[PDB]
Amino acid sequence: ARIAGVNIPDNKHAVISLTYIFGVGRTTAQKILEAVGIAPTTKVSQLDDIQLDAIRAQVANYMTEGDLRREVSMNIKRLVDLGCYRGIRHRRNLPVRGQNTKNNARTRKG
């Protein structure tokens, strides 16, 4: 089945497949499936197309993956062009969250 512009593998449960979609998580998928008749146990292949359409409408209510990616990029760019200490941190590839970086500083550069 295709949700939100990308493909989800059909071999496992609906909630687990929704987890794969960017911007979608397991708890959010459970919340989505609770409202509508679809149950988390049922597989995507088993699940009917009309159910999938209602699911797409529920996902559409939530902010989509492209929109989320663009907002994150926009926020980082806003910090950079503001030039705040946080923007300087983003530009210089150093932890902006305040985490201690004396020795294990590896996981910012890549």
């Binding site: 806003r78 503001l82 030039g83 705040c84 200490y85 946080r86 300087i88």
Partner: protein
């Protein structure tokens, strides 16, 4: 960051300086030592001079700065 019920933290002397500057819309920098004070919508547009530890650096309060503390725009460590 700060409990919403307590409201923003805004130091009294910078508060007084900024209201006495708002009634004039003066452009001369407000030289201040308190970098812990909340930037409010009222002080959008004018210029402060925030202590960075060694000297004061000007900070022209832009629109996209409310929600940040004064010291965020005054780096303290200078690393090349």
């Amino acid at each position: 960051p700060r409990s919403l019920k307590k409201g923003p933290f805004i130091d009294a002397h910078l508060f007084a300086k900024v209201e006495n500057a708002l009634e004039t819309n003066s452009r001369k920098p407000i030289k201040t030592w308190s970098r812990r004070s909340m930037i409010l919508p009222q002080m959008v547009g004018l210029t402060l001079s925030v202590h960075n530890g060694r000297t004061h650096v000007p900070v022209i309060v832009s629109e996209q700065m409310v929600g940040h503390k004064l010291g965020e725009f005054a780096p303290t460590r200078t690393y090349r």
